[PDB]
Design a protein around this ligand. Structure first.
Ligand SMILES: CC[C@H]1OC(=O)/C=C/[C@H](C)[C@@H](O[C@@H]2O[C@H](C)C[C@H](N(C)C)[C@H]2O)[C@@H](C)C[C@@H](C)C(=O)/C=C/C=C/[C@]1(O)CO[C@@H]1O[C@H](C)[C@@H](O)[C@@H](OC)[C@H]1OC
Ligand SMILES: CC[C@H]1OC(=O)/C=C/[C@H](C)[C@@H](O[C@@H]2O[C@H](C)C[C@H](N(C)C)[C@H]2O)[C@@H](C)C[C@@H](C)C(=O)/C=C/C=C/[C@]1(O)CO[C@@H]1O[C@H](C)[C@@H](O)[C@@H](OC)[C@H]1OC
Ligand code: HEM
Ligand code: HEM
Lengths: 393, 393
């Protein structure tokens, strides 16, 4: 009797038709996921937004419950699993050091990195795999620059962080040693920035103060690693998805070639339109009985709030299925909302603006080097994107 | 400048959002297929119906053209490769023998075969592969019945026919040997039926006459074996896809369990809704310059008419993306239209109605035996449906 969920087919970026049907007829409904408990699905923009910004919906039970999810393991911990007030303290300290200014300051280095990755693609010659060569490379190198990892070490961060990808084919024993080595490096680097501060993020976290608090050694170390993981896969996938769309939606490519000044606005409109997630935001749990648009969610029931479906909700975005690079307003939920709203978002926007800008500067004739019927899509089951994008230009 | 086409991915039944965009803004557009010549893609119901019904679009050049298509080899020949008047002669004789009345008379043996397969499937315990044990078994056995293959040879016949499926893992030599034996067998049976007529279809085809004309020895053979192939894979795949939908859409399962008399209507509505083909109907070729929606289609250009998109057109079907078993009217194009309209359609309706009726009658708790997200999909590249459907009940 609950619907089998996810609805989205991972082999592509198409929004499941069942969402539009639910948004009209059963905006809060019962779903059964591949693993974990039955849950409530929330689909409309107002409701998704209410849920994510209502402190009555918490994340803390995720530490002990059998969470609704697509994969048999549970991934627990980090900032996304924490509730106010301990969440709030870490976040206040991180957003103090990790500011929009600091994001903006990395644009010139992000462009240099993107151009170097295109040079390497030019050198290997066509067709070249935009996924392996650019999308999987840029986000992790940019995050290494943000944190302050010396560039001599960026190659091997890339290799370690690759073990933490939901698409990775690694043994659990290889992934564990990748994690031990990553942590050991970062703990060492935090210790070097303590004794001798630089202008990088690790130094600024070591010395951030709020009221009278500061991050502890372990907090620093978890938060640095977390930012790397949080920052990598989601950015890589969304680059791969945006290029894929530029290659398959010709009116969109033409527009941004004609008017590159529309790129920042195009990044917001694609973040809105691409239903990136296979399913929803990580489950929230009702702290007490709450009524949501006539349906009572009892205390402790999990809620799956779809930002995907929300961002395509006709009541909020007129002609919601149209990509309109000049759409205003565009208050989308693609970076979340409320206390857990993406703290990487100013940087992710810079990376996505730079990726588009540079790719269209360098490879304006870019297109798929294979038929779409032969694209391989990711079956990681967390985000939707291509495994390889062979391109010609 | 042409888009790559097909847009659909093979691994599911998702209808590409680009189809709706083209239906609104570019209902006749240039595309490039994975193999063969560039072509015109037609997507509105009116237009696809007009193409398929209009004698100016012929199939004869398929015999010598580099046809737009999804697999490297070409499958040419059979009735579908013919034009009036030779097509007309063959068809008139076939539908003389192969009547709606003959197809209905097979309902009670189809039910018996279906119960037998349910019994065999139940005996292998749960979970059971609904595809291998039921969907790939019913259509070929019923075509065997239709033709008058004696029931003792259905198992061998099923093994030969199996070699012709687009999913088949056979070598070239294996497929040739299967064809050669299937030809000799069918040859032998035709001769046996000429000497001693029975009430089966092979007998009716030997005896059928029209304006004093009749089928030759070679024609009969190729029509007989042609009916087996046209009738096997498509009905098997549509069984699999209908049952997959019933197991994943609980309200649809519920309505048909409550009201089995809705089944006929449901088979129509699902035939409409399911974009069974990866791509379009096989290409038609304009005999002379034709205008279609104000775009000039030059003589000889291939024309890809998407019955998948047509059946999903909002201009024809209110709420076209919604499955409504009581949809009326439902003038869908899932069995083609015009002179090459599916001539097995009455029998396919019988098989699909029987497949639903017997499974829901015997296994009313049937449901997936693994998460939908873990289903494996066919990569035959022609029709879409699951490779395997582990079920429990
Ligand atoms: C897809 C991105 C997402 O990926 C993840 O959640 C990472 C998932 C991988 C698959 C995990 O590794 C697997 O663990 C299994 C026990 C064995 C698998 N192999 C060995 C066979 C192995 O691959 C986790 C456990 C890996 C470790 C290093 C980890 O904790 C990674 C965390 C990273 C989380 C993320 O990078 C960020 O988390 C996501 O952030 C989004 C913004 C949230 O919306 C949400 O997205 C779905 C949330 O997803 C759970
Ligand atoms: C998707 C359904 C479609 O299947 C097909 O079209 C299936 C075609 C498969 C994919 C082909 O098999 C491949 O051939 C390759 C050269 C090698 C591959 N292996 C060995 C690596 C092999 O798998 C073709 C060649 C199979 C042969 C036996 C064949 O001619 C099959 C024809 C079957 C046609 C169909 O079963 C039905 O299509 C029929 O096509 C005829 C040509 C038409 O006249 C018409 O039949 C009346 C039409 O039905 C309405
Ligand atoms: C296109 C790229 C990105 C997308 C689409 C994205 C999306 C999101 C979303 C939707 C959330 C909220 C999840 C929820 O509430 O369930 C989130 C949180 C978060 N993001 Fe991102 N993100 C991206 C890039 C980044 C980057 C580059 C970083 C770091 C540099 C980052 C760091 C984080 C962290 C640490 C959280 C947890 C915040 C908290 O719980 O307080 N993200 N992101
Ligand atoms: C659900 C199963 C079936 C579906 C969805 C289906 C669909 C179709 C379609 C859409 C066409 C027209 C294709 C075109 O014009 O390009 C066609 C043709 C054809 N069908 Fe079927 N069909 C099915 C079952 C059957 C069966 C059981 C038989 C045999 C008894 C059969 C025999 C044929 C033949 C011989 C043709 C070619 C007709 C001609 O060219 O004149 N089909 N079918």
């Amino acid at each position: 009797e609950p619907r089998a969920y996810p609805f989205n087919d991972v082999h592509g970026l198409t929004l499941a038709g069942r969402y539009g049907e639910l948004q009209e007829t059963e905006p809060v409904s019962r779903v059964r996921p591949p693993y974990g408990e039955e849950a409530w699905l929330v689909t409309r923009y107002e409701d998704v937004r209410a849920v994510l910004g209502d402190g009555r919906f918490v994340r803390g039970p995720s530490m002990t419950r059998d969470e609704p999810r697509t994969r048999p393991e549970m991934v627990k911990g980090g900032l996304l699993s924490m509730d106010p007030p301990e969440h709030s303290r870490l976040r206040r300290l991180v957003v103090k050091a990790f500011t929009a200014r600091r994001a903006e300051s990395l644009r010139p280095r992000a462009r240099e990195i993107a151009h170097e990755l295109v040079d390497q693609m030019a050198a290997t010659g066509q067709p070249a795999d935009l996924v392996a060569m650019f999308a999987r490379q840029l986000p992790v190198r940019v995050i290494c620059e943000l944190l302050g990892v010396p560039s001599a070490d960026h190659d091997r961060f890339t290799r370690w962080s690759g073990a933490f990808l939901s698409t990775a084919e690694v043994t659990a024993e290889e992934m564990q040693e990748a994690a031990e080595q990553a942590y050991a490096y970062m703990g060492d680097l935090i210790d070097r920035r303590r004794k001798e501060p630089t202008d990088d993020l690790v130094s600024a976290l070591v010395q951030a103060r709020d009221q009278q608090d500061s991050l502890s050694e372990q907090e620093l170390l978890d938060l640095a690693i977390g930012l790397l993981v949080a920052g990598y896969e989601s950015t890589t996938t969304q680059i791969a998805d945006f290029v894929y769309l530029l290659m398959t939606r010709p009116e969109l490519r033409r527009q941004l070639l004609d008017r590159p000044e529309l790129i920042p606005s195009a990044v917001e409109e694609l973040t809105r339109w691409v239903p990136l997630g296979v399913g929803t935001a990580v489950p929230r749990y009702a702290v007490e009985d709450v009524t949501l648009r006539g349906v009572t969610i009892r205390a402790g029931e999990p809620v799956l709030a779809s930002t995907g479906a929300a961002n395509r909700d006709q009541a909020q975005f007129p002609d919601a299925d149209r990509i309109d690079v000049d759409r205003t307003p565009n208050q989308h939920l693609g970076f979340g909302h409320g206390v857990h709203h993406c703290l990487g978002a100013p940087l992710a926007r810079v990376e996505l603006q730079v990726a588009l800008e540079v790719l269209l500067q360098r490879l304006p004739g870019i297109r798929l080097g294979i038929p779409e019927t032969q694209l391989r899509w990711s079956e990681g089951m967390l985000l939707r994107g291509p495994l390889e994008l062979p391109v010609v230009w």
